[PDB]
Design a binder for this molecule. Sequence first.
Ligand SMILES: CCN1C(=O)c2cccc3c(S(=O)(=O)NCC4(C(=O)O)CCCC4)ccc1c23
Length: 132
Amino acid sequence: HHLVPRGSNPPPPETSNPNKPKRQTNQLQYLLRVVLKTLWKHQFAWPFQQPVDAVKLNLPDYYKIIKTPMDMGTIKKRLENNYYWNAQECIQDFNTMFTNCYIYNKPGDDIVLMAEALEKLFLQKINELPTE
Ligand SMILES: CCN1C(=O)c2cccc3c(S(=O)(=O)NCC4(C(=O)O)CCCC4)ccc1c23
């Protein structure tokens, strides 16, 4: 951990906003109960379920390169804690998650194929959102 750089990890992203008024909506409810749940169980979801551990995954420069980390565990907590004001904010966090993967990794990488498959499913599921 000295001679060869091993990296280090930030605290995970914030998942609650104590100042924010509770505002439940049908789209946010659908995002939690259907979209995220469907994405979570996909065969390729596991790498995206928790924050990247730059040290344990041997990605020592991950957090040099990725300034706005995001993962599905964080998105799940944000939906649970009514952190998002609207569906768009939630969608933006999914976009950040996928694009982080594309930014860090090379286009031909296995993890990129996985992210692309999840992203395609996500975009399909987004078409299902209720009419608020
Ligand atoms: C989605 C967060 N994420 C990365 O961007 C990333 C890059 C490289 C490896 C890796 C991993 S890993 O568990 O070390 N390897 C995952 C796999 C790979 O070939 O990268 C191994 C089998 C499936 C994908 C988990 C989450 C990651 C990455």
